[PDB]
Amino acid sequence: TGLLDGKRILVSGIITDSSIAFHIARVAQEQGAQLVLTGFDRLRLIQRITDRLPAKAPLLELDVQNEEHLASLAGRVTEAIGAGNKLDGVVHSIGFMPQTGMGINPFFDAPYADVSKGIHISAYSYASMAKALLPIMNPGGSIVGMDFDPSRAMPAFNWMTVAKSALESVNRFVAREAGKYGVRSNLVAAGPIRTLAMSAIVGGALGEEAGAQIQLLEEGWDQRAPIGWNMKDATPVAKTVCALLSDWLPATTGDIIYADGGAHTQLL
Amino acid sequence: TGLLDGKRILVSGIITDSSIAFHIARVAQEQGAQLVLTGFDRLRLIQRITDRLPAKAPLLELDVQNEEHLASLAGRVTEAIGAGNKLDGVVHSIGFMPQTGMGINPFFDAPYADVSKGIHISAYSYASMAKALLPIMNPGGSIVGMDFDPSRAMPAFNWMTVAKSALESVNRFVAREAGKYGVRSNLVAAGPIRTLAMSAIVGGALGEEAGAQIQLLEEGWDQRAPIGWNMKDATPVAKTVCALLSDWLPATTGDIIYADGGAHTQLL
Amino acid sequence: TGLLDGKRILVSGIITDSSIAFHIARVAQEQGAQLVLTGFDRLRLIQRITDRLPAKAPLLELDVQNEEHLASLAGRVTEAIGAGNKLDGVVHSIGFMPQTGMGINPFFDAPYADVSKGIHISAYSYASMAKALLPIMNPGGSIVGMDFDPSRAMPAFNWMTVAKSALESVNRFVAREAGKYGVRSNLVAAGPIRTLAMSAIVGGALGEEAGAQIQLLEEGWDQRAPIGWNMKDATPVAKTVCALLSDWLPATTGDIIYADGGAHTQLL
Amino acid sequence: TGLLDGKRILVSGIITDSSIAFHIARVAQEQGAQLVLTGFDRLRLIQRITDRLPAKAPLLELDVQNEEHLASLAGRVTEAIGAGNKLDGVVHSIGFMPQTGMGINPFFDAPYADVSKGIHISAYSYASMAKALLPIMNPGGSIVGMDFDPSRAMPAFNWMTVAKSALESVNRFVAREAGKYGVRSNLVAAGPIRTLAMSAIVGGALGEEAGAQIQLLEEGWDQRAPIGWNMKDATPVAKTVCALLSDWLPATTGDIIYADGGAHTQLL
Ligand SMILES: NC(=O)c1ccc[n+]([C@@H]2O[C@H](COP(=O)([O-])OP(=O)(O)OC[C@H]3O[C@@H](n4cnc5c(N)ncnc54)[C@H](O)[C@@H]3O)[C@@H](O)[C@H]2O)c1
Ligand SMILES: NC(=O)c1ccc[n+]([C@@H]2O[C@H](COP(=O)([O-])OP(=O)(O)OC[C@H]3O[C@@H](n4cnc5c(N)ncnc54)[C@H](O)[C@@H]3O)[C@@H](O)[C@H]2O)c1
Ligand SMILES: NC(=O)c1ccc[n+]([C@@H]2O[C@H](COP(=O)([O-])OP(=O)(O)OC[C@H]3O[C@@H](n4cnc5c(N)ncnc54)[C@H](O)[C@@H]3O)[C@@H](O)[C@H]2O)c1
Ligand SMILES: NC(=O)c1ccc[n+]([C@@H]2O[C@H](COP(=O)([O-])OP(=O)(O)OC[C@H]3O[C@@H](n4cnc5c(N)ncnc54)[C@H](O)[C@@H]3O)[C@@H](O)[C@H]2O)c1
Ligand code: NA
Ligand code: NA
Ligand code: NA
Ligand code: NA
Ligand code: NA
Ligand code: NA
Ligand code: NA
Ligand code: NA
Ligand code: NA
Ligand code: NA
Ligand code: NA
Ligand code: NA
Ligand code: NA
Ligand code: NA
Ligand code: NA
Ligand code: NA
């Protein structure tokens, strides 16, 4: 019946009802998965948001920069899903770069402390979460992280693009470790999605020049994509994550699946 | 229930019960698809082989070098599935290179007539089949072709690797045309599979040097793959094709999905 | 003194004074190389054109589809440069695709006979020329071919882009063969250059839609290139070919050097 | 005469007479460049080492993690080369990862503080140096950094490979900034070179497993490279850096030139 029937899956990264991870969680539940959610900092808000998912799911606190949160995560997950049960899936949908590393602020003016925080949250934490959770993952399991194609430089996204380049490299090493558990590790490289932060940026939150550049980027994406690209609809991305969480891509690991309308395959 | 329930899917490329397309067809039927099969030249043999699939499927003759076969294909498919019905999926699992273009024969000694025949069958025909079948494909449909990663030169596969480089390029253009129909086009890049031809080559059919090189290639593949690689098991490849035929990769087109154990993501 | 002082270098592909190979030949002579030229079909025209190069150079006929021309080429070169002398460099600057394979004519409507001729001239002939000339190349020599980045599909260039994908694959195999002679093989992927044919296409020779698409492609190239791109100036491309012909890239082979203003490294 | 005659070029990264930057500096001086050198921490040692270069060159202290060193660098360079003179070239040959991020120590056990230091020195500092030096670079200038192909995960190099993935991304953004000055930015991806640190690692300094894996990596490199690979000879790498510092790759930026014997173009 459901693509993910019986699977136990941890989903990080919900902060609003427009988070990509909110849609990942909704579709996974539609497909029969039993979820455990993790949230950062504003847990009352996240609980109120995820009350709207089609099924109940326990919410655990996880700041990926907090060593104590990471050290206790597996035991808290096991308590939530029951002793003797393990996870079949993990979704990393976590990203952050201080404002100095994006938008109008010149690329050269981002101090390393800011870049380092952004790489910690956006790239290193993919390894951190796999380290914490692989000991409680079943063979045949799947770890999926969210990516944005960084193979070519862009306007505005600056150091966040560098962080995604690092994340793609981290994923290839996580795949080596995860394989020892019979677990796959892959990224979904999505086209642009109008999350609250992205809408705020297009609205000029990081400077008019950066907002204009990002609006132009979105327009070219739908133009290039042979099947089009709808930045207001995260469901195609959520479905692709669920495909990697399923048993139907069993020989793919260390890899990147592009849920971008095909835009990255076309020049114009 | 089934991943492909209700979908009508054409599968080319069955010649033995170890053909990758035989396993594609079996898994697709297991997942509820209604198939139409195409075969080249030895139709009594192919019918006897496909009698072992879990469900009946009409068999149509298709030599992709035959313009008349291509011009009549859509009408013959429609007759097989019924007027007013269209295809949801197409599988291209067709490849050939004359012996002069592979194995012990020096790369420089393949005459162009032989290379051209191999590129016709292995690359151009992906465009030929899409041209013939897109007019009878439903929106939301999917065209999938079989690939072998040609981004780096290898021993022995010589001009067939060139043909796959061409195929990957053709796929990106087919995606442009298919998008106008609401149809996706993608390739699955598989690791090595012990088909009858591959077993015969490892056995020395194309020279001892080529057999030795191919055996070494297979060994390195399983070694590199973080989840391993079983050349005797086509099912992981067949499942990946079915994933692309399903509705669960709806924003991927013009693209390549690697069903190779992750080997291409690792150096050693 | 000269970058190429004392080197003997064969340059194919001159047909007008705006051919990329005309500028390759001029710069190579400026840098002290002694050239042998090859031309296709219109030899009186090519001789009149190359009379304007800074130094004399013998002109040999070479139709790369003519097996007899290829079989006699080495002996004719040796006669031109003197017994006991060998070539240090070879430049392949040859490309062709029938009109049916480019521009307004739909991608699906190019007959295979036309595509096959274009792949013969544009891709297979890189292997043909290396086969003919490696027996008369010195260790430390260099073979260079002209490329146009085909990693993503474009409007209009259709089957010529497929042919470049094939050429890049051929180059990686030629490098394997050339290495046995101590010879390197590489491609230069150039940005768009306003040759006579390209000007004619922008002028609508292959349909208004194709001319418009190509003009848009040129505009985006200069916009993306961090150092800009001047389609009216082939000299930066010619210099890059000369760099690969020199001794200053001695550990690069099977590879692609991008002389494109950096455009392919940037999204926008 | 000399490839770099009259050019003023800053070279970082000398620590021993087997440093890649020592050979870069030697070849650049052989080709007529006037150098300024930067060294980290052990300046008496570095001065004694660089006394063996064919020409005198002033040595400036530069710890790329020291904001004060970076803020004063341009003024100290100008003092060394004379008011009214600017640099034509910059060589970044700087890399470091704490031991916890390489070798026998499990990938997951590297603490982020260590990874962050390694990314600071190995990747961010490429942007730091360009920021400091672009204001005193001439149009037509060239910035070159040293890379090791990180597109596929490897044994042992672990987080240093992640750092190179980040560096490649940084280079594409530096190219955008440098283009405004008429300056190119590129990396040379070298094959393995037996520096003192690399010899020490093969000797087991980071665990026997890591030493064995690295020795196997070197062996496969020479085997794959169509022209071979000599890990005891940095001169082919130094020459390639000088090519990018010259005027002979004037349309290449944001890019990576592979000085690796062609190994990355071949599977086996
Ligand atoms: N929106 C897009 O266009 C787009 C495109 C491609 C990929 N992505 C990626 O998708 C992922 C989800 O981002 P989103 O667009 O849904 O935005 P979002 O703001 O909805 O989600 C980002 C999440 O990161 C979490 N986070 C930040 N710091 C954290 C910490 N220290 N510990 C734990 N969690 C932390 C936030 O709480 C938030 O839940 C990110 O990796 C993002 O880069 C986004
Ligand atoms: N076996 C492997 O290791 C491997 C790995 C990756 C990709 N592939 C690819 O998978 C596809 C299927 O090959 P296979 O390994 O299953 O071998 P196979 O021999 O079982 O199938 C090849 C098919 O091509 C068909 N064919 C040949 N000429 C034809 C023509 N003129 N018209 C129509 N059909 C024609 C043959 O009849 C045969 O059915 C090919 O594209 C192949 O390159 C194979
Ligand atoms: N102009 C561009 O924008 C551009 C960009 C990147 C790469 N290129 C490539 O550069 C190379 C040179 O093309 P060009 O732009 O200078 O155009 P051109 O028309 O000046 O040169 C093409 C050459 O191919 C030769 N040729 C055609 N058929 C032949 C045959 N059968 N035998 C021998 N030679 C034959 C022609 O005689 C001509 O000399 C081609 O490979 C082309 O694809 C061109
Ligand atoms: N040896 C190889 O196999 C190889 C292969 C490809 C690329 N590389 C790269 O070449 C570059 C040079 O490395 P190498 O192999 O010549 O080793 P090396 O040890 O000789 O040089 C590394 C340099 O980095 C400098 N450095 C470290 N911390 C610094 C700081 N805080 N500030 C300024 N400088 C600092 C060191 O002083 C040293 O001079 C590195 O980027 C390295 O990753 C090396
Ligand atoms: Na959304
Ligand atoms: Na649930
Ligand atoms: Na941690
Ligand atoms: Na579109
Ligand atoms: Na099989
Ligand atoms: Na059926
Ligand atoms: Na046809
Ligand atoms: Na393995
Ligand atoms: Na010109
Ligand atoms: Na000459
Ligand atoms: Na020939
Ligand atoms: Na520009
Ligand atoms: Na050395
Ligand atoms: Na000097
Ligand atoms: Na700094
Ligand atoms: Na070799």
Residue numbers in the entry:
A (entry chain A), B (entry chain A), C (entry chain A), D (entry chain A): 2 to 269
The authors write:
The enoyl-acyl carrier protein (enoyl-ACP)3 reductase InhA is a major target for the clinically relevant antibiotics isoniazid and ethionamide. InhA catalyzes the NADH-dependent reduction of enoyl-ACP in the biosynthesis of fatty and mycolic acids, which form an essential component of the membrane and cell wall of M. tuberculosis, respectively. The reaction mechanism is postulated to start with a direct hydride transfer from the C4 of NADH to the β-carbon of the enoyl-ACP, followed by formation of an enolate anion, which is subsequently protonated stereospecifically to the pro-(2R) position of the α-carbon. Tyrosine 158, one of the only protic groups in the active site of InhA, was shown by mutagenesis studies to be involved in catalysis.
To rule out that the Y158F mutation caused major changes to the active site, we cocrystallized Y158F with NAD+. The Y158F variant retained only 1.8% of the WT kcat with a 2-fold increase of the Km for octenoyl-CoA, which corresponds well with previous studies. The Y158F variant incorporated deuterium with an efficiency of 57 ± 2% into the 2R position, which indicated that this variant lost stereospecificity of proton donation. The strong difference in Dkobs between WT and Y158F indicates that the Y158F variant is affected in the protonation step. Spectrophotometric analysis of the Y158F reaction showed a transient increase of absorbance with a maximum at 375 nm, reminiscent of the formation of transient reaction intermediates that were observed recently in the enoyl-reductase Etr1p and other enzymes from the medium chain dehydrogenase/reductase superfamily. In summary, these experiments showed that a covalent C2-ene adduct accumulates in solution in the Y158F variant during catalysis. The isolated (2S)-C2-ene adduct decayed uncatalyzed in solution into the products octanoyl-CoA and NAD+ with a decay constant of 0.186 ± 0.001 min−1. Although the Y158F variant is affected in the protonation step, the enzyme can still form the (2S)-C2-ene adduct, which then decomposes into the final products in solution. Thus, the Y158F variant catalyzed mainly the back reaction. This result is in line with the fact that the protonation step—and thus product formation from the (2S)-C2-ene adduct—is impaired by the Y158F mutation.
